UniProtKB/Swiss-Prot annotation, chains A, B:
Topaquinone (TPQ) is generated by copper-dependent autoxidation of a specific tyrosyl residue. The keyword Disulfide bond applies. NCBIfam families: PRK11504.1. Catalyzes the oxidative deamination of phenylethylamine to phenylacetaldehyde with the concomitant production of hydrogen peroxide and ammonia. It comes from the Bacteria. Its cofactor is Cu cation; L-topaquinone. Binds 1 copper ion per subunit. Induction: By phenethylamine. It comes from Arthrobacter globiformis. This is Phenylethylamine oxidase. It is an enzyme of class 1 (oxidoreductase).
Length: 620, 620
């Protein structure tokens, strides 16, 4: 019944049939993206109309198409041919990854480069990576992938331990040509293995860990209805899933007495970029847009009970399309559970004699994705006290290179001869805000220091200031940790009992933003990552901070072009885009498999409630 | 056996007997502080010599004394008379707090002020607060407390809901004299109650929370020997307890193969300051040095199983002295347990076919203290992967005032007529470092941005720089979140297998430091709080960033006087002092009892190990 329900196997099958009958899904066609569209703005939208957006690739070279179909009515709404030299290429297809290694294996320049290094071509794996846009005019309008080589000494060996430096190839994956093979010189291939399950490396496993048992003898406190609607401790929301963004949260609201109060209309990680900081021509082009180029949802893991998710776990198993339109289920791809979170509130009062302690809890909604060597966990947390938090967990195997004789300013050494280039992992959270409704505004709040003098004779006073962001051209903001900068999203038409606008405060981690030179290709294509906070006016088609077609797009798409409309955002339907990331100088302890590191952000109520919202939590 | 064992009841009784026999503890004497001294530098040394330091107050007004006792040999080692007008007053005695309300109840200026407000003196509670150093010349050399009034409507009423603004009194707690009563005008006493156990305020309690059961069916994975020595998952340490500092961690080391490798010799929170930013003369003197003036260990709570600490809990019950030298046990004052901490490391490799997941754990050592309206939890965490983390949890009831008609730049409104002055909570962690031994240095690491040009033609390169701090005069450092600034503590004489010095990296939260004007009294007394990082050369008597005697002490002691010695810290026995804190603009949701907010820091291995230290963790 809900318009926000997960897509079902049947809906995807019907899309495939509609496309096929319309003549849009022939044998040379491939589905590069398929996803359900959210309902358009309309608080009285009753007539159910499930619409799906499809990107259709053509393996013969014909122009691709963007298609919108209505599953409810069984029709094609629109179909537009795309000029990819102008608007960007479609996301990389899983089947194109195989092509790169196979093509290079018969190229005489590639074989000659391997022969010089005495490498057996049957043992050389090729990481197929996105191309970006640089100086090669012949790549405009063409689907390119670039390949870097790694040696696998045996089928169970970790090839990442054995990078083949000084060698890179470019491949046209539709015409199946190797356009360039660049050999800048021979580097020794690092010899030590990195097999973290080999007992020779792990040593004997510990026998000292005793079990921790976490159970819920009466079951969990949350309910799931209609497949994906969650109710938990006054919270209400819908858990969506999209093959590009992954888990998406809809209709986040809090039951305050008798009123269901909206907070956030849609929350997602709308892009994530991994730029590399090694100036070697072998890797100086390397920038992953994991969401926009690869689609993080299609690489979601099946999460194992007791290993990935511990406790009383409720699973969702989302359905996506494969490249031919058949439904594919990601079994146990989303974990949901509640967790103890320590003390919520505590006071022992001398004068009243009352000793009071209450415990906190959080709702966890998580999924994990694997893109090549990297594995990322996406965690959304809901707390009893109204706090909303996102956390990304980065693990996997670091991307490697040779470590040069004489050192490097841009690579760290992990093992003899083995390097790890410096890089960042930068996320963009897209928060379609709805604080008590859609009339919202953002204020930037700085601490204000005061000088000793009249009205502050002891020099102890300090204060704060708030600046309303009234237009998009003034809504591109930078962090300032030294002045305690935060941003408040408020509803100027909804007041608390003290007659102040209700609000939520965004607390950032204030990590560095994109470090690349502002004139670089990556700074133009990932402009969102150069600033901590953007606020736009809501529009149906402004979905991603990098635009719809990120792969090989020349730059400026997305947030810089949206912001240029300079729309009114003072008491309007607005969207907050928060940039946050990790700057990774790899350490020896990251090798051969990296312990989790984390980054995120949180939102806390700021006069949203008329008093603490957790006074009715029991002691038990 | 161990020199680092907790003080026993017998040891404290023996100190009492030694002081009595020596003539230093007659009926007019009071013990204001008593604690065990750490062993001097020198491995093994004096077989066993347990020494205690004692601050002895005299209630007749004679000069107090600082005394060192050997409980092993039954002797007084040294006893010095203190000139408190020069070097500072002793910590506040618990029995002095009770004096303030009683003295004021019979002062005719106080009574006239209450009568002007139609308040019954029997219902007026007085919060007795430390006095600081301001413009009152008659206070030099006297023990002064200042009092602020709150109305308690009935014995179980929360008095914090009813501040009596416009009124403050100063009390000499030795001569039992009210020195000044200041009345700047009548303010309405806020009328709403703040009784968070009253059903009329809580409403019906939730019935929706189902239990979460955390058990360890084989018991915990850590062992406790000698009363306070902990071994857990390669970690080794001793848990100390001091009445001033609270929980103190000694001899933190990690078992790496056959070698026990030191990391931290001693870790503590050596001071904490809570400055208020309201320039009203009623409160502009208000600054709590909870550690130095009040002694946070003295007010540690007994922690309730299942409420304060959840799971399979091991308790310690530290013993302290009362004001007469009798031992007082703080039953269940320290909780210790291990906690699941999600995913440790995870990778699903396409080429090898190996799927690998491991879970993380942490060891938790915690205590909670209550100082008037505020309650603070102190949490030390040890992780499987070598990370050490500290977290402070702030809760309790916010300190209140009237909310002025017309508003305020320095006070938040929480309820009709009820205000909460702006303030900070700032901690100083004292880390006596011992990275692989005592020869350590500190480097400051900043990210380095690089310009597009020769050697970086695509403008993607970025790097980092490290600056060694060679002498104390250059070791006073500020945060820079924008450049990703961190500090590395390393051992230049101990190298990992890549021939790089082993190290640990300190990651700060980069919250604002002390906001008061640098000319203010609090900026001089809490100079440590104006900078994020200090590094000193280790010295036996340099224990606290504020000096030994903080109460009513002007500037002149502590970290600014230590660093003036400008000693060599480049490969030497060094101490890191890290300032970190919360800036609190109270919100409506903080009332009537505040949900926990947190701040802290962590240290991560940086080439300390030759590879990941958790390759031997089993799959479970
Ligand atoms: Cu990384
Ligand atoms: Cu506070
Ligand atoms: Na909105
Ligand atoms: Na040291």
């Amino acid at each position: 019944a809900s318009p926000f329900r997960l897509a079902s196997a049947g809906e995807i099958s019907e899309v495939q049939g509609i496309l096929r009958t319309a003549g849009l899904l022939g044998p040379e066609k491939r589905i590069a993206y398929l996803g359900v569209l959210d309902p358009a703005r309309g608080a009285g939208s009753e007539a159910e109309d499930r619409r799906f957006r499809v990107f259709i690739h053509d393996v013969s070279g014909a122009r691709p198409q963007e298609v919108t179909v209505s599953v409810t009515n069984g029709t094609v709404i629109s179909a537009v041919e795309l000029d990819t030299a102008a608007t960007g290429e479609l996301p990389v297809l899983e089947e194109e990854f195989e092509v790169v290694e196979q093509l290079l294996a018969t190229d005489e320049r590639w074989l000659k480069a391997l022969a010089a290094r005495n490498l057996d071509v049957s043992k050389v794996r090729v990481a197929p990576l996105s191309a970006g846009v640089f100086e090669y005019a012949e790549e405009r309008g063409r689907r390119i992938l670039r390949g870097l080589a790694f040696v696998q000494d045996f089928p169970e060996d970790s090839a990442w331990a054995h990078p083949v430096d000084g060698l890179v190839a470019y491949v046209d994956v539709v015409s199946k040509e190797v356009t360039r093979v660049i050999d800048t010189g021979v580097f020794p291939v690092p010899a030590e293995h990195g097999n973290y399950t080999d007992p020779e490396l792990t040593g004997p496993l510990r026998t000292t860990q005793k079990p921790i048992s976490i159970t819920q003898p009466e079951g969990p406190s949350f309910t799931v209805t209609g497949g994906n609607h969650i109710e938990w401790e006054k919270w209400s929301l819908d858990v969506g899933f999209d093959v590009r963004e992954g888990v998406v949260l809809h209709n986040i609201a809090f039951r305050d007495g008798d009123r269901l109060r909206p907070i956030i209309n849609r929350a997602s990680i709308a892009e994530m970029v991994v730029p590399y900081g090694d100036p070697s021509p072998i890797r100086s082009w390397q920038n992953y847009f994991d969401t926009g180029e690869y689609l993080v949802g299609q690489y979601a893991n099946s999460l194992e009970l007791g290993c990935d998710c511990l406790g009383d776990i409720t699973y969702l198993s989302p359905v996506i399309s494969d490249a031919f339109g058949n439904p594919r289920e990601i079994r146990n791809g989303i974990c949901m559970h509640e967790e103890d979170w320590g003390i919520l509130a505590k006071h022992s009062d001398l004068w009243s004699g009352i000793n009071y302690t209450r415990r906190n809890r959080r709702m966890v909604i998580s999924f994990f994705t694997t893109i090549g060597n990297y594995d990322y966990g996406f965690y959304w947390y809901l707390y009893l006290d109204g706090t909303i938090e996102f956390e990304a967990k980065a693990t996997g195997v670091v991307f490697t290179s040779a470590f040069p004789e004489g050192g490097s300013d841009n690579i760290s050494q992990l093992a003899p001869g083995l390097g790890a280039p410096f890089h960042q992992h930068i996320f963009s959270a897209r928060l379609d805000m709805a604080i008590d409704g859609f009339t919202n505004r953002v204020e930037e709040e700085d601490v204000v220091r005061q000088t000793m003098g009249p009205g502050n004779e002891r020099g102890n006073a300090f204060s704060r200031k708030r600046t309303v962001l009234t237009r998009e051209s003034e809504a591109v903001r930078e962090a300032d940790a030294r002045t305690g900068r935060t941003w408040i999203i408020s509803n100027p038409e909804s007041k608390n009992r003290l007659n102040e606008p209700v609000g939520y405060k965004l607390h950032a981690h204030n990590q560095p933003t994109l470090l690349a030179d502002p004139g670089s290709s990556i700074a133009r294509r990932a402009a969102f990552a150069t600033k901590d906070l953007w606020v736009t006016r809501y529009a149906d088609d402004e979905r991603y901070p990098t635009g719809d077609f990120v792969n090989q797009h020349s730059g400026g798409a997305g947030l810089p072009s949206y912001i240029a409309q300079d729309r009114d955002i003072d008491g309007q339907d607005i969207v907050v885009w928060h940039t946050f990331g990790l700057t990774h100088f790899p350490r020896v302890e990251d090798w051969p498999i990296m312990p989790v590191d984390t980054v995120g952000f949180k939102l806390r109520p700021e006069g949203f409630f008329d008093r603490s919202p957790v006074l009715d939590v029991p002691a038990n």
